[PDB]
Amino acid sequence: GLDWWEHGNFYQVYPRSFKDSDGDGIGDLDGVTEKLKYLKDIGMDGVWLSPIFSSPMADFGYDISNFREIQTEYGDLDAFQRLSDKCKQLGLHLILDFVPNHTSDQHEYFKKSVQKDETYKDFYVWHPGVHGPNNTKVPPSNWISVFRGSSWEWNEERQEFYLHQFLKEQPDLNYRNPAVVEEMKNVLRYWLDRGVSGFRIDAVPYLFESDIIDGRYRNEPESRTTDDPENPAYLVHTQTMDQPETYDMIYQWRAVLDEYSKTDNRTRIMMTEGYTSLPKIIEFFGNATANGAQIPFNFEVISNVKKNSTGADFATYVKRWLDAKPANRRSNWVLGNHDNNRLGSRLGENKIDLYNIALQTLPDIAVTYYGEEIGMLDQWIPWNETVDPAACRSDEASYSAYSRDPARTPMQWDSGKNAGFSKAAKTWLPVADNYKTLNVKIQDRARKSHLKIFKKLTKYRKRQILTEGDIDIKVSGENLLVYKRKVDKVGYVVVALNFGTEPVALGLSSLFDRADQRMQVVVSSNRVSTPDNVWVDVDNYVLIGESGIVLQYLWGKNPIVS
Ligand SMILES: *[C@@H]1O[C@H](CO)[C@@H](O)[C@H](O)[C@H]1NC(C)=O
Ligand SMILES: [Ca+2]
Ligand SMILES: [Ca+2]
Ligand SMILES: [Cl-]
Numbered sequence: 044g045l046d047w048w049e050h051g052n053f054y055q056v057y058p059r060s061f062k063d064s065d066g067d068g069i070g071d072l073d074g075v076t077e078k079l080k081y082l083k084d085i086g087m088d089g090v091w092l093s094p095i096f097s098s099p100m101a102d103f104g105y106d107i108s109n110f111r112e113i114q115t116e117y118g119d120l121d122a123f124q125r126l127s128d129k130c131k132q133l134g135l136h137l138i139l140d141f142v143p144n145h146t147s148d149q150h151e152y153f154k155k156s157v158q159k160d161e162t163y164k165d166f167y168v169w170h171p172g173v174h175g176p177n178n179t180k181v182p183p184s185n186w187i188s189v190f191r192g193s194s195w196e197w198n199e200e201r202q203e204f205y206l207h208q209f210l211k212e213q214p215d216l217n218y219r220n221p222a223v224v225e226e227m228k229n230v231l232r233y234w235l236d237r238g239v240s241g242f243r244i245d246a247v248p249y250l251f252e253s254d255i256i257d258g259r260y261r262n263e264p265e266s267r268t269t270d271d272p273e274n275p276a277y278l279v280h281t282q283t284m285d286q287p288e289t290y291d292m293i294y295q296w297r298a299v300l301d302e303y304s305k306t307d308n309r310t311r312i313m314m315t316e317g318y319t320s321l322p323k324i325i326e327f328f329g330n331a332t333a334n335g336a337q338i339p340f341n342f343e344v345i346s347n348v349k350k351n352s353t354g355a356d357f358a359t360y361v362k363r364w365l366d367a368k369p370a371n372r373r374s375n376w377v378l379g380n381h382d383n384n385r386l387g388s389r390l391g392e393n394k395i396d397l398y399n400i401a402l403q404t405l406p407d408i409a410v411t412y413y414g415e416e417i418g419m420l421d422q423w424i425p426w427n428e429t430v431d432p433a434a435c436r437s438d439e440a441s442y443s444a445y446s447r448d449p450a451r452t453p454m455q456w457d458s459g460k461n462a463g464f465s466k467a468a469k470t471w472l473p474v475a476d477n478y479k480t481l482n483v484k485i486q487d488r489a490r491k492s493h494l495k496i497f498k499k500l501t502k503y504r505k506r507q508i509l510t511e512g513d514i515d516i517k518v519s520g521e522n523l524l525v526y527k528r529k530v531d532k533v534g535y536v537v538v539a540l541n542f543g544t545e546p547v548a549l550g551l552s553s554l555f556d557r558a559d560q561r562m563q564v565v566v567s568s569n570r571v572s573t574p575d576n577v578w579v580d581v582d583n584y585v586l587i588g589e590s591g592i593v594l595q596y597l598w599g600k601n602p603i604v605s
């Protein structure tokens with residue numbers, strides 16, 4: 044008897060790009076609500092929305108000026124309630140994006156902090172630095188912002204530097220201040236009171252920095268993986284990431300969630316965005332005395348799998364996650380989000396179905412970034428139309444290395460105007476040029492298509508074998524990854540993923556003891572010609588390049604487990 048989330052399908056909506064409902068070219072809450080039934084029909088359980096709160100959009104919602112307010116163009120609190128009520132009818136859990144690390148520099152708390160307001164003077168991390176030789180100002184430490192340059196920003200009015208781990212428009216909250224601690228968990232209660240099933244928590248590794256010692260902040264040592272001192276990777280982040288107090292606060296936040304779970308037998312869940320080392324990701328699950336996040340994102344895989352990764356490479360990172368995961372915790376698999384190039388563009392357009400197969404058939408929790416289920420691809424956007432500050436802080440020659448906008452374009456619903464995302468003359472980001480032939484409606488009608496493969500996976504994974512089965516991973520050569528998932532007296536599933544360009548015979552008898560000369564085809568990559576439901580020889584079947592196949596053998600019935 045699993046809790047709702049343990050084998051859950053989670054879908055990330057980027058609200059600005061999901062569905063426009065009021066003709067301004069901007070996705071909004073009412074637009075999401077129109078589309079929640081679609082999300083249920085493709086097998087989703089939990090819907091996570093990126094920042095919908097009041098924010099000047101310097102970082103497109105991650106710079107929040109009021110954590111208790113819906114941003115105007117997205118809607119109002121009624122629009123939120125209708126979204127929440129619709130989720131409840133459909134049996135979907137709503138997950139909101141919680142951004143504790145920083146506020147907008149337009150937040151009232153920050154404006155008052157700059158003025159040394161007695162209540163807000165210490166809401167942020169301020170330090171004067173030191174005046175140096177030749178009347179120069181030395182910042183309080185050598186720390187580098189994730190968006191490049193110093194993470195200390197001088198404020199003339201206050202005559203101090205404030206800490207910004209992200210943009211200078213995003214001042215870091217001082218979680219050593221108890222007033223800040225209390226205020227931010229009341230933000231969680233505010234939304235828990237309004238019905239949400241949990242939160243995805245932004246930038247968890249960066250919450251606490253180390254404290255002052257003898258009036259100074261400690262510098263960080265050079266990493267020697269780059270010579271560029273404006274690049275955050277220039278330093279080893281011994282002082283600005285992975286601090287022990289960070290984990291303490293995650294656990295405090297989970298306790299607030301647990302207060303609400305006791306109320307009504309509906310587990311509030313926590314997801315955490317942590318681009319950090321695998322052991323420091325794992326620590327977010329919890330420790331001996333305290334639970335943390337049920338879903339600290341498996342960014343071990345996403346950060347290390349590349350376009351030229353082999354099947355062996357993919358297996359290495361999958362196995363590394365599994366070897367490090369504590370037995371009492373659930374895995375999750377994620378290969379896309381709003382900060383990465385779209386999966387097909389990033390990892391190889393031919394592998395869209397291979398990777399959707401992996402994401403959906405590996406154990407426990409599967410994550411989908413909006414559009415991955417139809418195989419959306421990045422859209423190149425001109426410098427003049429790009430809005431992502433990570434691009435605009437670069438230059439016309441080279442903003443495409445940095446820009447996240449190509450992965451944030453409007454969802455492609457149909458072949459009509461703006462791919463059916465909006466009736467407006469212009470959309471906030473351009474619709475991808477491929478939209479007439481890549482959209483939900485066209486894939487819905489096709490015999491085989493990414494969406495039909497996707498839908499087959501999200502349904503099939505909810506049966507007993509893929510819900511309850513173990514996992515046994517084997518690699519043949521450099522590029523044939525195969526894994527078996529078995530439930531005794533029920534059956535077993537074999538996933539075979541061919542990352543290489545050459546076709547290959549599965550040769551399963553030389554990989555598992557397990558016989559059954561023949562297995563039944565459940566689903567396969569778009570280019571595989573083998574019809575569904577036929578039987579194939581597990582030794583001689585040839586899997587074409589860059590393709591995957593899901594194979595089944597039943598001893599008993601394999602029911603949907605609800
Ligand atoms: C794969 O690509 C990366 C980055 O583009 C490169 O550094 C690496 O050498 C490539 N691997 C091979 C085997 O060429
Ligand atoms: Ca709109
Ligand atoms: Ca911080
Ligand atoms: Cl519209």
Ligand SMILES: [Cl-]
Nearest residue numbers: 336337372373
């Ligand atoms: Cl857990």
Ligand SMILES: [Cl-]
Nearest residue numbers: 499502503506
């Ligand atoms: Cl099925």
Ligand SMILES: [Cl-]
Nearest residue numbers: 561562563578
């Ligand atoms: Cl048979």
